[PDB]
Amino acid sequence: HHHHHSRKTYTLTDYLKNTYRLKLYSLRWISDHEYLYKQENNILVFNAEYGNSSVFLENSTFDEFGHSINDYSISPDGQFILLEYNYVKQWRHSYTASYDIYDLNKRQLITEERIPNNTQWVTWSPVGHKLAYVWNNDIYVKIEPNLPSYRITWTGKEDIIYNGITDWVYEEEVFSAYSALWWSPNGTFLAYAQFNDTEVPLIEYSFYSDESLQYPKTVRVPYPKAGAVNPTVKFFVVNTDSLSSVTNATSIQITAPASMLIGDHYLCDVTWATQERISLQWLRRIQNYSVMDICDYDESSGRWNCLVARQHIEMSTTGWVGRFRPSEPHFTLDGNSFYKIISNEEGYRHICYFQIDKKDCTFITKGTWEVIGIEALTSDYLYYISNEYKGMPGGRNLYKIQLSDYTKVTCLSCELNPERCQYYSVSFSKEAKYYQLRCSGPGLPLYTLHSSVNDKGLRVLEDNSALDKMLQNVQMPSKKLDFIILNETKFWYQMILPPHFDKSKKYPLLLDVYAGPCSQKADTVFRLNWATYLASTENIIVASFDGRGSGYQGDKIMHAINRRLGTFEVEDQIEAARQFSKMGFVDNKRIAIWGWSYGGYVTSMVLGSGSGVFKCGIAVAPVSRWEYYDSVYTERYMGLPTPEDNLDHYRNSTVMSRAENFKQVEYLLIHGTADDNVHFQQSAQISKALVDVGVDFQAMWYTDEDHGIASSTAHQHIYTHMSHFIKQCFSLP
Amino acid sequence: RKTYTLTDYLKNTYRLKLYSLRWISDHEYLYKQENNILVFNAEYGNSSVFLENSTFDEFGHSINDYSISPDGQFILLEYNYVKQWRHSYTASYDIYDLNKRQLITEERIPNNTQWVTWSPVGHKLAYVWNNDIYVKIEPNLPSYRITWTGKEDIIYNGITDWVYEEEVFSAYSALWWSPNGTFLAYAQFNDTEVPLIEYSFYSDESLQYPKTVRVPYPKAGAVNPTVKFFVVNTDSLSSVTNATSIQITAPASMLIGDHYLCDVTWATQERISLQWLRRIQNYSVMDICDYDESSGRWNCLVARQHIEMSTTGWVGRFRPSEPHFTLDGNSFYKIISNEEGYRHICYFQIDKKDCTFITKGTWEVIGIEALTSDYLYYISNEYKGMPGGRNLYKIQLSDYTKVTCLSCELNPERCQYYSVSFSKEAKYYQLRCSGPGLPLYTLHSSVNDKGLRVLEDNSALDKMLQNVQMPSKKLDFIILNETKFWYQMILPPHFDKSKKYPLLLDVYAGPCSQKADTVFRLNWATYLASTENIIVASFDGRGSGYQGDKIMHAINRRLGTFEVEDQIEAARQFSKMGFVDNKRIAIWGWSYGGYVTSMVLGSGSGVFKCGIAVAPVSRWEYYDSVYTERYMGLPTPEDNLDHYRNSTVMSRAENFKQVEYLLIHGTADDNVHFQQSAQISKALVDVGVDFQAMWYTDEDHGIASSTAHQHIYTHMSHFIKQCFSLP
Ligand SMILES: *[C@@H]1O[C@H](CO)[C@@H](O[C@@H]2O[C@H](CO)[C@@H](O[C@H]3O[C@H](CO)[C@@H](O)[C@H](O)[C@@H]3O)[C@H](O)[C@H]2NC(C)=O)[C@H](O)[C@H]1NC(C)=O
Ligand SMILES: *[C@@H]1O[C@H](CO)[C@@H](O[C@@H]2O[C@H](CO)[C@@H](O)[C@H](O)[C@H]2NC(C)=O)[C@H](O)[C@H]1NC(C)=O
Ligand SMILES: *[C@@H]1O[C@H](CO)[C@@H](O[C@@H]2O[C@H](CO)[C@@H](O)[C@H](O)[C@H]2NC(C)=O)[C@H](O)[C@H]1NC(C)=O
Ligand SMILES: *[C@@H]1O[C@H](CO)[C@@H](O[C@@H]2O[C@H](CO)[C@@H](O)[C@H](O)[C@H]2NC(C)=O)[C@H](O)[C@H]1NC(C)=O
Ligand SMILES: *[C@@H]1O[C@H](CO)[C@@H](O[C@@H]2O[C@H](CO)[C@@H](O)[C@H](O)[C@H]2NC(C)=O)[C@H](O)[C@H]1NC(C)=O
Ligand SMILES: *[C@@H]1O[C@H](CO)[C@@H](O[C@@H]2O[C@H](CO)[C@@H](O)[C@H](O)[C@H]2NC(C)=O)[C@H](O)[C@H]1NC(C)=O
Ligand SMILES: *[C@@H]1O[C@H](CO)[C@@H](O)[C@H](O)[C@H]1NC(C)=O
Ligand SMILES: *[C@@H]1O[C@H](CO)[C@@H](O)[C@H](O)[C@H]1NC(C)=O
Ligand SMILES: *[C@@H]1O[C@H](CO)[C@@H](O)[C@H](O)[C@H]1NC(C)=O
Ligand SMILES: *[C@@H]1O[C@H](CO)[C@@H](O)[C@H](O)[C@H]1NC(C)=O
Ligand SMILES: *[C@@H]1O[C@H](CO)[C@@H](O)[C@H](O)[C@H]1NC(C)=O
Ligand SMILES: *[C@@H]1O[C@H](CO)[C@@H](O)[C@H](O)[C@H]1NC(C)=O
Ligand SMILES: *[C@@H]1O[C@H](CO)[C@@H](O)[C@H](O)[C@H]1NC(C)=O
Ligand SMILES: *[C@@H]1O[C@H](CO)[C@@H](O)[C@H](O)[C@H]1NC(C)=O
Ligand SMILES: *[C@@H]1O[C@H](CO)[C@@H](O)[C@H](O)[C@H]1NC(C)=O
Ligand SMILES: *[C@H]1O[C@H](CO)[C@@H](O)[C@H](O)[C@H]1NC(C)=O
């Protein structure tokens, strides 16, 4: 006799088995009018205008292929499709695979001059159907899918010389991509980077593999830890139109500016401006100085030249440059001008308009909020995402500013669905005629299509009504997004609150932390995660807090932990917990903390602080000492680990030094043994330190799991194990 | 009213006193008073300071050990000790003239020397350095380089590689001086095609990049090291020509395939015996090699070969036994399994195939301890048919039925486990009693076996112990299939059989193991019984040793079967004894014990609530070849692959859903690779089994660093207490 009251909760199995699924609407714009989508495994083509669709590629076309197809890529001219199979993951972005090209107008596979197995990367030219691929660390180009390839580079060498692909650090920390190949807009030129890792030390770890392997494998990866020798980089442009079968290809080198060549530096951004103009952004090893070169092709020479009067410098006196790297430029059509996000005089990131020949740029946006990204640029309008709306740093809306009058700024998403939608991202059609808006919260995700001419909504792509239907009688948690004031500054936090939240009660509280530089953990995003289960089923409040060092709020907050990681950011989580208890609905005896990666570091630093505030905590794949982490990320915030730079603080910010304070708390340390990112080493040293001072704690290694501990079975195992640990700690049955 | 606490165990509050002596002659031995080296006369009981602490104050290094040349004229001082594996280590050495009471500063033994030993007489010195053998005729003269093939991880001269060290010789050294020091026999090991186990060593926090340790280690069925044997005349060395080592080749019976050198024993000045063992360890051969005066060569008559083989298993307990030669070397005694499968002493004449057994019975000779012209002294478990007792016997060589027990009656209530150490010519012997009472060390004269005196009686420990509620020890047997199987129980103080106690089964259970005995111990179990009121039991089932081949060989080729089943059945019996809480039965073990613990927990028996496995083997293909193949044969379709694949803990993953499991393993375990637990953990994760875990960074198989040792026992205590609802 329940009278239809919601009696279900969001349980651990619901999360682990994905009972409640967020529907997505993932599309690929092929033109300015149409996009590809997946229905019941067939590749449909939709017409943005009307919404009429037809089948582009039936789900039976390749059922005789003989292998499982991981992904596909359609040539920009829509004449061929690249089929990806034998996918074998490497790091976060990299992987190898086999490829076959299917000709769409002959409905036939191409059996001649096939792309080799173990190919590291493949990319179509942006127009037409030329192919560039990397194999054995060398670059190859196919002008037509059925013709022999032209070998561009001959120096490729496993673990030493990389042409067209990155090494570990560049992939993970510099580019966020494996690809180091950049086609000119019309395909004439193929720009690439070459990395030399000759003297970069190798991290080595065991890989146990299937139980069949009698002897474990030692994995060895070139990986510069803080202060170690970094890979070097060279940049080249090759004219693909002048490739020859009788002569080797001529790659034209573009050298980094003299102000970079004086020392260690990085190539940090490549952006084509026009068919014959390419911009390159370089960053010094001490990451407070970057130079943007703008280089033009010379018809006579066949060379590329960068004019000093076109160099733009971007520096910082308070920290590093950019959120994680200097922003990318968005060039106007003629390539004589560009827009880009930079910190203004007050430390807020806003869009600056540069003329190619001029040092002084002018700001088209301003205010105490920040521009997240530039999404599209037309002749009349620039579209961007910002967190200006209602001054909520954790909110995201799409705006459009008239290039001819900066006072004319329109918000396109703010008011579409104000109660349901406050976190937007966008996907523009090939020439911005249309755009898809994706709102991730705080209500159920909603995907809509729009024409930009007069920004009316065309239709609802995905509204997650099915999920909405399932959730009706489930006691879901709510989210509170608000701020507290420390030293006259707003600091935002979020709390996942148990259903039927009652201020009169004292809830156990879990602090879910990340808190690295430019992080944001308090936002308007709707999530179905572990926190969802903890709040809904176990009545635990899960809070996150963005303190000093956090992003999207100006350099004053973000740069506060410069050269001093493991200080304010750690101190702030503690102060947040104190604040949370003073609110009156938190049980002081049951406050815990957990985090992954930087978050595991903070968790561990917090637990080893002697603050007495936290009963227990969980660190997953934590950094433990900055010298063990990679050079480009670490040194960005910590400078060099030398007596003449910042060695003292490197040594003062390790978790191992706080070992003794762990006697006051219950600690669960978790790490995957094949973590190529934060090495198991880091946790191995935390554990040895705890053992050395006689502190008891809980541990779990994950055989062959990497930084994401994302294998289906491992993912379920870790959240199960962490759930027991938290329940135990909080005396929950 | 205090109990024996975890801290007591961890901090060694109550220490067992020892009386470690080393004989120097037939009537004197050395002893170390905390601080001091004394010389004792065996006859009178009187000492004088032999080496005063202060002799080396000005040294400037910290001394690990010392070694007196047999003639008594020099003392080797060992320092800068750096442990390698179980027995192997590196160290620096200095030689001090005793009569001139000064350091030798000339032609010093190098730093990083791998092994050094004095000749059995005089003061010649042999050492191994950088995998090469060197000889020093006199402490202060250049050393002669015997071998030139030494090469790290590849060629080992005079020292063993990983597997020979751990599993064959139980020693780092592969050097054997003839009785009067004339000859230096040595083995050479070639590991060229032996695969390497690689694992990470994290080192001090200061190391930025972990180091990868790489060790030549043959896992089951892999390529093995090869071995060569050599003998060098140290009396005809030169300072001008290189020494010439005479090779003794293995017998043709061994040369037809993979084989091992398993025993080297000098019989006389010019006769050496070598035992060889086929890779399939059920066939071994003893060659007896004589020096040929006119040829400079060593010849082994095919007619003097002695074969020892087994039809039911491997040969020997862990390896063929060592022979004990009569003074003339034309005859010898060695322990072999008789026709009923019981290990007894057999008397061989060098020239004849058939030997005669001088002992017999349903009990076993543990070891031959000494032999004189008139008697053979040996240790056995004959006393009262108790396999876990040990007593010293002496057999009259002119009449084998004339057998005197020398220790059975010294103190029957307190002493039932003896070991012995005879003086250089058996004039005297020290008796070491290890239980069931407090260890008792006594000295005796072998002429009439009279007790000269009590060397250490542990009276101090006995007084301290009066204060603490100590647990007791019950040693008994149960009957399974008309056969006796022994078990022990450490029972809590004031034990009351009308009460239901939690029980922890402490298991090892490897082949020839013995966990039920009369030895007195102060260990983790003591604490659990005394403070936590937990019964900790151990059981010796099929596969266990010292009770004959029918029991020991029952697991031949079938590891992970009967020995596992018998631990479960034993637990079932214990619960039927009435004083066990059957909802609180746990099991734990280390190494082979971790394997059995895991196989038991993965058995679905439903008998055990929880368990702890420490450094367990998880699948036999991961373990070393010598130990593994000895019991399992080869992992190939034509041999025993099926059972190798059938006996893994990983295969029993799903059943772990019924128990609480704690898995612990040191990451620098060179013996049972961390790999073994990494595969267990992955298998449990794959079937969605939750369990507890703990890795120990940089710890090896003993997890024996002071802090790690304390930390593991503390962690395990919490787990068992949680499991048994003990706050
Ligand atoms: C340790 O064992 C090693 C391999 O079992 C052994 O190496 C082998 O040595 C021979 C002679 O130096 C090398 O080769 C020669 O003759 C054979 C014909 O039987 C040819 O195949 C070779 O080309 C060459 O002419 C082998 O190459 C070598 N095997 C290897 C290195 O794997 C060592 O000599 C042994 N060490 C000692 C001290 O005995
Ligand atoms: C990769 O980088 C290394 C330097 O880190 C280059 O090695 C130098 O090459 C020159 C010319 O042969 C040698 O004389 C030097 O000894 C090398 N330095 C070393 C090995 O440290 C190497 O040439 C580079 N390769 C490429 C293709 O750029
Ligand atoms: C793509 O861009 C290129 C560069 O702007 C265009 O072409 C000329 O570039 C080629 C390079 O091989 C030179 O050989 C020609 O000489 C260039 N121009 C002159 C005046 O000589 C090319 O036409 C563009 N393609 C498309 C389809 O627009
Ligand atoms: C063994 O090692 C020691 C220590 O390295 C050797 O001696 C040192 O040599 C340096 C000069 O190279 C001196 O400045 C040190 O003072 C020496 N240490 C000491 C304690 O004196 C020693 O000579 C080595 N060789 C042998 C055979 O032991
Ligand atoms: C004693 O034996 C060694 C090793 O066989 C001799 O030395 C090597 O001989 C080669 C030439 O055949 C030299 O190039 C090496 O430098 C020598 N050293 C080593 C460490 O192998 C040594 O000369 C021998 N000589 C005699 C004459 O018996
Ligand atoms: C030594 O052990 C081996 C293997 O356990 C015994 O051999 C047999 O092995 C051969 C070769 O692999 C097989 O073809 C036979 O089928 C096995 N069975 C039998 C009954 O022999 C060998 O007999 C043992 N030697 C001794 C002396 O017992
Ligand atoms: C949508 O209708 C137009 C009108 O003819 C047609 O050209 C187009 O092919 C249709 N869409 C698809 C996806 O085929
Ligand atoms: C790649 O591998 C497959 C199967 O291994 C083989 O049949 C094929 O011919 C190889 N080469 C290419 C280019 O796919
Ligand atoms: C291209 O370059 C490679 C290496 O530099 C060389 O071996 C090859 O001969 C060249 N090919 C031609 C056709 O010159
Ligand atoms: C870059 O950082 C270094 C070290 O903090 C400093 O010496 C230098 O002045 C910085 N550059 C700028 C422009 O602040
Ligand atoms: C100082 O101000 C910052 C914010 O600007 C605030 O987080 C902090 O708590 C104040 N406290 C300290 C401890 O310096
Ligand atoms: C900790 O910081 C102080 C300066 O506040 C520095 O002197 C000390 O050396 C640092 N710790 C380490 C381990 O260097
Ligand atoms: C031992 O005692 C005897 C007394 O008979 C004495 O002659 C001998 O030298 C003593 N020496 C030592 C070192 O005890
Ligand atoms: C040691 O034995 C050998 C027998 O060949 C002999 O030549 C040597 O001299 C012996 N020791 C002596 C006689 O002291
Ligand atoms: C019979 O064999 C042994 C003793 O010989 C015994 O331990 C075992 O439990 C009995 N039965 C079975 C089926 O193993
Ligand atoms: C495991 O053993 C059984 C028989 O005991 C056998 O049938 C099975 O095939 C064995 N393992 C393998 C890998 O074949």
Coordinates of C-alpha atoms in Angstrom, one line a residue, chain A residues 17 209-211 702-705 711-717, chain B residues 650 653-654 657 678-691:
Chain A
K17 CA 25.3 -1.8 -14.6
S209 CA 49.2 -9.7 -19.3
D210 CA 47.0 -12.8 -19.7
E211 CA 47.8 -15.5 -17.2
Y702 CA 44.9 -3.1 -10.0
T703 CA 46.9 -5.5 -12.2
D704 CA 47.5 -4.1 -15.6
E705 CA 45.1 -1.3 -15.2
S711 CA 38.3 -1.8 -17.8
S712 CA 34.7 -2.8 -17.3
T713 CA 35.5 -5.3 -14.5
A714 CA 38.1 -3.1 -12.8
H715 CA 35.8 -0.1 -12.8
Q716 CA 33.0 -2.1 -11.1
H717 CA 35.5 -3.6 -8.6
Chain B
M650 CA 43.0 -18.3 -10.8
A653 CA 38.2 -17.3 -8.7
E654 CA 34.4 -17.6 -8.7
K657 CA 32.6 -15.1 -3.6
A678 CA 49.0 -10.0 -9.7
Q679 CA 47.3 -12.8 -11.6
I680 CA 45.2 -13.8 -8.6
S681 CA 44.0 -10.3 -8.1
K682 CA 43.2 -9.9 -11.8
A683 CA 41.2 -13.1 -11.8
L684 CA 39.2 -12.1 -8.8
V685 CA 38.5 -8.7 -10.3
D686 CA 37.4 -10.4 -13.5
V687 CA 34.7 -12.4 -11.7
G688 CA 33.7 -9.5 -9.5
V689 CA 35.0 -10.8 -6.2
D690 CA 35.7 -8.2 -3.6
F691 CA 38.8 -8.9 -1.4

